[PDB]
From a paper:
CCs are quaternary structures comprising two or more α-helices supercoiled around each other with cyclic (Cn) or dihedral (Dn) symmetry. Here, we describe variants with all combinations of the aliphatic residues, Ile, Leu and Val, at a and d to give four classes of peptide: the ββ class, with a and d = Ile or Val; Lβ, a = Leu and d = Ile or Val; βL, a = Ile or Val and d = Leu; and LL, a = d = Leu. Peptides are named systematically appending the one-letter code for the amino acids at the a and d sites to “CC-Type2-“; e.g., CC-Hept becomes CC-Type2-LI. In summary, solution-phase data and X-ray crystal structures demonstrate conclusively that different classes of Type-2 coiled-coil (CC) peptides—i.e., based on abcdefg repeats with predominantly hydrophobic residues at a, d, e and g—adopt a range of distinct states.
To explore this switch between assembling open α-helical barrels and collapsed CCs, we tested if examples of some of the latter could be opened by introducing polar residues into the hydrophobic repeats of βL and LL sequences. However, unlike the parents, they had accessible thermal unfolding transitions. Both transitions were pH dependent with stabilities increasing sharply below pH 6–7. Neither of the L17E peptides bound DPH, but both sequestered its cationic derivative trimethyl-ammonium DPH (TMA-DPH) with μM affinities suggesting that the barrel states are accessible. Thus, L17E expands the collapsed hexamer of CC-Type2-IL to include a seventh helix and to reveal an accessible central channel. For CC-Type2-IL-Sg-L17E, the central cavity was hydrated throughout the simulation. Thus, both the IL and LL backgrounds can switch and open to access barrel states. Moreover, this state appears to be more accessible to IL, fitting our contention that β-branched residues at a and d promote the α-helical-barrel state.
Residue numbers in the entry:
A (entry chain G), B (entry chain A), C (entry chain B), D (entry chain C), E (entry chain F), F (entry chain D), ...: 1 to 30
């Protein structure tokens, strides 16, 4: 139910953050 | 409940800990 | 009882973390 | 019992993390 | 059940984030 | 039992993360 | 059971993240 759903939303947000951090790394890189 | 009664706030705090990321993931792109 | 109380404490801590991540987002954005 | 105790320990650790993220925000802001 | 699954998804996302943070560190390094 | 133990392990890892974030804060401040 | 296992996986991932954040701190410090 709602708890599991919330944790899935959190997991999704952290994936988005991971993607942004990768983009920041790529922008610093050559 | 709170966490996402208690579990319920838990869902609230875990969901809200999810928004909070969407704004980081996002602040780092810009 | 004690279990419900512990989960309420957890929910509170996750809200504090959400607030800090919001602050981190704002500091990056500024 | 032990479960409630473990969740209290988890809540404490998350508060520590929230404090560290706030400190990271302050260091970026300064 | 669904709860365990959600936590597994969270664990996966955090590993991705850890990898991205490592990449950001490598890009800063030199 | 095993559940409480797992949550204690999770609490430990989150403390280590909080320590690293504190170190990141100190490195930015310096 | 599977829940405890999932939480153990989460704990491991957060340790990996702590290590990466430490590496990011080291790269900023250098």
């Amino acid at each position: 139910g709602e708890l599991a759903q919330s944790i899935k939303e959190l997991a999704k947000s952290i994936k988005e953050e991971a993607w942004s951090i990768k983009e920041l790394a790529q922008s610093i890189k050559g």
